[PDB]
Amino acid sequence: QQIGTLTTETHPPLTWQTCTSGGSCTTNNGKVVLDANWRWLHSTSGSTNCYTGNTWNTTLCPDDTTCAQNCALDGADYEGTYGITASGNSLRLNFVTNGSQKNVGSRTYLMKDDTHYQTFNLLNQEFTFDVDVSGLPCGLNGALYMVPMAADGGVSNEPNNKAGAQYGVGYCDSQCPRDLKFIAGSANVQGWEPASNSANSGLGGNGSCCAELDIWEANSISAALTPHSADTVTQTVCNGDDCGGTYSNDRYSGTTDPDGCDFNSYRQGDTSFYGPGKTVDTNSKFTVVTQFLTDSSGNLNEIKRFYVQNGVVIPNSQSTIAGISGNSITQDYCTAQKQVFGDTNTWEDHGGFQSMTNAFKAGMVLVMSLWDDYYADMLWLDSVAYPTDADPSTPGVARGTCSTTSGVPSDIESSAASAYVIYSNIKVGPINSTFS
């Protein structure tokens, strides 16, 4: 995709911290950028849209290559159009913004400079942030996570990609998303079809795969921490059903792990731990600490979680499911959880902890998003039962307190239009350096 010249792109400021030890943190002046999929996409020749609603202009975009040559991504009105407010240490994302048109959700990335994403290697480090999820009801997902996107947004080896990181180009994840307009320096017009169960109501011929570390996927009801493996940790392009993931005829036929090794306290049997008025009280802001421990060879072997609220350090809740012990993500936990729950261990299939180690070594980009779920209504995160018809007595079925009828986008985009999330006070450093 090309650089549009009709609207200046100014990345809103976001300060975050590097810590070296407890009580020793210094500030970094970062910036945030909106994902390309949310942007106006128009001809390089003028103002004519290449994409409108959920379909393409086939004169401007007769094929994937020509479309990339012909079409430019332009600058974003962050607050006015997208309800994104980045100031000081905080990033607020609003769910619905009814400006000149209706906007639902957003996906943003942390930048090091105007043309590069910040990258992270969290081996032997912890990532820590504050979050307010009080305004997130059933069906919402405020996600803070990491994917090994190319730092430059792909421009170095993609001649038709000039927009790059500057315009939030280069997304990939463990679902191999096919709703992306641009993948690996090409458009995705070929095979594009409208689809009711896609976030943007459309799906192209190709998907964008990579590893994915879901540090935080949450609302006021439930939270999940989920690493996802991949054969190749950085971006690969997949074709149709061979993609696997959400929209394939065979979810597990691809090169990535679409399910991940998840820890949701409620799913792991403790319904008193996380939620409104609970041990981690979602009525108010809290600190989320995620630690990435290694074996003696420097390969990831454990993900730990701590919360801090009112100055009280709260260890992650123990899994209470018989056969699934502990309060962290380890190979023993992942194997036991998949076996006991009766879920396919695609996590292990695509390299598990070694895969995530490789993803960290490649360098991770920080993603901060707010979304509703056109495929499963976020029931996988917060429902009394997922699947909706499954036995709530069966281990792994219950994930939260939300009804099986909750979270339908056409419902909640109305009823929960005021929903928002605030991420703040991001800190990265060695184990134990960001809290005490």
Ligand SMILES: *[C@@H]1O[C@H](CO)[C@@H](O[C@@H]2O[C@H](CO)[C@@H](O)[C@H](O)[C@H]2NC(C)=O)[C@H](O)[C@H]1NC(C)=O
């Ligand atoms: C991106 O997806 C499109 C659509 O599926 C692919 O285009 C197909 O290419 C094959 C092989 O050249 C042709 O036989 C088909 O006619 C094309 N289909 C359509 C609908 O145009 C394209 O190959 C994909 N690109 C990559 C890199 O995988």
Ligand SMILES: *[C@@H]1O[C@H](CO)[C@@H](O)[C@H](O)[C@H]1NC(C)=O
């Ligand atoms: C598509 O783009 C072309 C070239 O700018 C333009 O002439 C045409 O009006 C657009 N719309 C349609 C429906 O073809």
Ligand SMILES: *[C@@H]1O[C@H](CO)[C@@H](O)[C@H](O)[C@H]1NC(C)=O
């Ligand atoms: C971090 O703190 C915990 C709890 O005090 C301790 O068990 C662990 O050894 C510490 N690890 C490092 C690397 O400092």
Ligand SMILES: *[C@H]1O[C@H](CO)[C@@H](O)[C@H](O)[C@@H]1O
């Ligand atoms: C469009 O229709 C599909 C069924 O194919 C639903 O899953 C989706 O929620 C939307 O209503």
Ligand SMILES: [Mg+2]
């Ligand atoms: Mg998709």
